[PDB]
Swiss-Prot record:
Monomer. Belongs to the photoactive yellow protein family. SUPFAM superfamilies: PYP-like sensor domain (PAS domain). The lineage of its organism: Bacteria, Pseudomonadati, Pseudomonadota, Gammaproteobacteria, Chromatiales. Coiled coil: none annotated. It comes from Halorhodospira halophila (Ectothiorhodospira halophila). Residues 23-86 form the PAS domain. The 4-hydroxycinnamic acid (p-coumaric acid) chromophore is covalently bound via a thioester linkage. This is Photoactive yellow protein.
Amino acid sequence: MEHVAFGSEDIENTLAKMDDGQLDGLAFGAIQLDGDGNILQYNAAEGDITGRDPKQVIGKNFFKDVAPCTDSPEFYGKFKEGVASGNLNTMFEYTFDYQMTPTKVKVHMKKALSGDSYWVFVKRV
C-alpha cells in the first residue's frame, strides 16, 4: 500500500504526487474537495467505510448531495470558514449516519498544496 500516516504534519506534500490510483492505496479515507465542496477525488478506503462507489460520487457536492449529515456548523461550518480564510487544519470526531449504519469516525480537514482545493481524511475510531 502507500505508506503515509493519518494526521501526518506534511500529508498535503505527500499527496500532491498521487493520481487516483495511488490515492486508492492509502490506509484511510481521502476525499479532495473544491472550495464549493464539490468532490474532485474519492478513494477506495473511503468507499469501504461509507459504502459509496467512488467513481459515482466524483462531481457531486459533498455537503448538499452526498453527506447531508455533515451540513452543520460542526463540519460544513468549519470547512467554509477555512476556505474563506485560505487556511484549514482541524481534526475532530463525527458520526456518519445518512442511509448507512451509524459509523463513528475521526475526520481531518486540511487545505491542499493546490490552488483552491481541500482534503477530508477519514478513519474509523
